[model samples]
Target chain A: RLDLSTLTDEEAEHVWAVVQRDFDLRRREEERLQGLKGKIQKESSKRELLSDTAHLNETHCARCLQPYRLLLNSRRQCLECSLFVCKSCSHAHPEEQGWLCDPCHLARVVKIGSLEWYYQHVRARFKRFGSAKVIRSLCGR
Target chain B: DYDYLIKLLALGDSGVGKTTFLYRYTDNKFNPKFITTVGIDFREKRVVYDTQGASGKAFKVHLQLWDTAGLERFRSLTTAFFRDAMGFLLMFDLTSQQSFLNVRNWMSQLQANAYCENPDIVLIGNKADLPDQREVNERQARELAEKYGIPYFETSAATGQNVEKSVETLLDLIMKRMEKC
Candidate 1:
């Protein structure tokens, strides 16, 4: 609380400026604190989603369920399932270019080859037939 | 065809070295007098990654980097592009404290627009080579990363220090998350 009654004109003006700046800073801090709260909540859940091997000293392979030291054998995470598996248990998709847990690869429905191929194919089709033709090709009635 | 195609975004305040950093990583070049990005710009690079298999073969990773305009007017246009980004290089200028403070806003915007609950994000303090002009220190940046539970790096686009490594780390995290999606 500022006591304005005892201040001279110039002093009052300076005080007002300080008050305004403080108010502005407080507002910004409030915004930042709110944003931080949301981020913490989201990250907490995300931590749960990641395999325990992410930080711990020891973790078990998702497939084999055998414990391994992080230093001795690095764990490979599947791109589709986010599961941490031993290198042997993780299947690296040669075409797709990412490691996948057996279940995800085995259960996958739409096999879009490596994202590189998908984009390249799309670019080629878009160039040859244009947008309308590509749309029609994908959605033939 | 390449193995993985990763989409990453360079986000920060205008003149915080986002464009220069992207060019440094993708083209191995940088410009001191580069014009501000109005809407968005894009560049691509391919990196070879080693497989852990017995064959010990290397795989090609196609990286698509989106350099977005950081001015306020382009916010709407940039938000439209966020949904496709698999990872983000959330950058700030080491010379500017305001830019560093604005990181929370940039991150919140990313989370709001991204399709997933938690998008792969990395904190970067650009222009780290300019020690005399640095206002944001490494300790502060590291603390922010710890608070968010994300990785942080101090890099210099002018010298090409840690630019590629930062992108590679972000892409690696995104690749791991892609499996769970």
Candidate 2:
């Protein structure tokens, strides 16, 4: 029922490969972000942090247990901030001004809301694949 | 080591504060900083439980508190530990209805992993301090626990209310079961 009559076999193959690879990369990135966010939130909420700060309800870094580190890393592309962290943290913190990393910064910009949803969806996919591997191995893969 | 070490696993919906409950019971501290358990978080505590038969010998319940991730993705991994568990802390967020419904599903999962023997279960409706925000009523919680023939408790980890008693009651029950073993 779909129309793809204009595409050549080679063109279709190349397009499919590109789409698949892009999806795979995006999924992997999402899972990594989820794990990192979990680490930050859990660390910030521990009993030690409660002893340190009276206002426990306030938003703090999912890592480092500080407020506005994310904001600083996110709003101003300070070179030191970008250079200090790994690619993923740098990507999560996008700066709006001063010496932009351009593509890396843009990736961070995209992470504002989609990261949580992406993690949930990607986790589901990963679980299926992992379970499938067990099934296959039992069948003598 | 009173001839039995009952293992209880705690699980619930995200933001249910199962870890905070563990902290309060074990460390006697109240904290608001909580993230859902990732993979598994565990701690141990000993409770001296009394036997009704006047046995002066108190059983030391070395509570292995296995806190598990509540995410749906983590369900399959749960099977690995479901076996050999002596007790289950069937926890649900009082503010979340979805978690209340999932208790049945979780019970089914427990049964599936069970090797023909139904273990002791306790239905715990935690976060009892926030009565204004409670979505699961006491009647419903009690009905579920009664229907399953298990003990129920409405506990608050924030104020340390019934936190210790909840585990204490479970240990008392476990001690009774140990006599049978």
Candidate 3:
């Protein structure tokens, strides 16, 4: 959608300085944001890992990894992670009357607190290709 | 190396104070000086950006501000780089009617060459302190900005009226757009 063949070589190459090192800088910038995104996953993946304790057995709670010792009505399975948790390790749904295991509930809270939207914003704000890169190559070296 | 690197560009008719406006923004001091820029160049600043009533998260934003020559001769070269910027500072001189007129031409050029058809842009009317010599009125310039669906601010690079606020508004807009994408 753009052409600069009308200009002489000297003036065309002038764009080189305008876009110099921009590509390299963007590559490293990508690395840092990836690191931050990794940090966000780190915050939630651990809970997913620990909660996958091979599904609860006949006696223990999903979180705290202890014996349940609850009434049959109180011992329940979380719809999210499908992990059986005792009464103390659960939070009731505000409207559903159903409850989630503490680990999954904590995961949801972290989702809201993670500033993930900002992370996504920073991700979307950048363009990985074209723009300066096009001129960078057209201008020669 | 900071939390975020935002690349922004300033474009307006030549001698419309694009360089001076950025100098005032980055350094916060005015030097009544002029050495015309021939091609393209840049300046850098690291600013702390706070989320707007959402997270209260403090972020370190590194700004790479690109300055382009507004001379007609460099139009093609300068417009080519428009695709590189995440947002724009579209400026015009309040003292010059012709420069203000060229704002529409500049906006059209941005629509043609910018990364997207309609990109994030902030319209600035600089030299607000020179009320005596001013020719562009707030209602007209703001009306023009509204037609383009962007915010317009009357800024005085000499007195630092909306320098910080204008750029911050653009940054805020970019951040919000980022989340949407």
Candidate 4:
């Protein structure tokens, strides 16, 4: 029940600053991780798109190894991995096939090394150089 | 290969056994001795699910559990890690009323740091096995959870009671929200 209209210009600006600070930091983190995108793209082209011939007769998520009821709905099979996941177990991919499980999507991250590896690299440099300079390095600028 | 990568964060007051709760969930082991977390730490686990038929479809899930130091001194450093988290477990010791009282501060810290206004959070009352020394009851914790519009769980990291369920419930909520997006 916060009324932004009630805030004076100065207060509004300060509030905006706080939000922008968080946004900027997160943007920088994404920027730091952006290198993986190209690597992932390269890897995807190298790997064959897995064709799944699996029958979706089961009432469970393939990833969590948990059973689900038929009425639970939208159990997805990744066309690439051919794995069936309950709606809760799968994430929607932009692929023509639509839904994918965690493993298929995470394969890219794992192939390039775990997210922790990249994060650790970012953390080491960020701590020493400050974000402004680290971002420059990360961005190749 | 994992189909999905989920990032979860643990936040609470120091010595509320946050680390122990995560250790039990991720590694299925418990350390009775309290070890102070200096700034941050993390753990990972992968889960696999298989479909029903002979042509069973299986998938792997990668879970990244980030552990933050509960000491106030590390608050600044810890809050910085909150931005990308998909879910949060706000833990407090059932044996300590003060620890429970500080849940509000931790929630505010997350609210201020996270990308979204209402981040996915589960209020956990840890050390539930210590009934004789318990200062915060389930009702109190549930009421707080209700106030914050989140779910609540009473867990015993030492015995691994409700540890898995607490994390699953939080992840379920996160996935549901992601679905909407």
Q: On residues A33-107, what C-alpha lDDT tens digit does candidate 1 reach at each position?
A: 455445445534554665454554136666666676743556887877676778766676634546776545433
Worst 10 residues of 3 chain A by lDDT: A109-118
Q: Which ten residues in a row are the worst by lDDT in model 3 chain B?
A: B50-59
Q: Using lDDT as the measure, name the better of candidate 1 and candidate 2.
A: 1
Better of 2 and 4 by DockQ: 4
Candidate 3 lDDT by residue in tens digits, B1-181:
5656777999999999999999999999998888766657788899987654412345567888989888877676677667667899999999999999999899999877676677889999999999999998779998899898999999998999999999999988887765452
Q: What C-alpha lDDT do the candidate models reach, one value each?
A: 0.66, 0.57, 0.74, 0.67
By lDDT, rank the candidates, best first. 3, 4, 1, 2
TM-score against native, each model:
0.58, 0.53, 0.69, 0.59
Off by over 4 Å in 2: A1-141, B1-4, B115-117
User: What DockQ do you compute for every candidate structure?
Assistant: 0.02, 0.01, 0.12, 0.05
List the candidate numbers ranked by TM-score, top first: 3, 4, 1, 2
The most accurate candidate by lDDT is 3
Residues A45-87, model 3: lDDT tens digits: 7556765565454577756556767455467888687767787
DockQ of 2: 0.01
A115: Cα error in model 4, Å? 14
Per-model TM-score (chain A alone): 0.33, 0.36, 0.42, 0.36
Q: Write the per-residue lDDT of candidate 2 for residues B69-135, one digit (tens) a residue.
A: 6875545543444543456777888888878898888888776654323666788888888889988
B24-99 per-residue lDDT for model 1 (tens digits): 8878888888687755556667788653433334556667677777987656555555654678999999999999
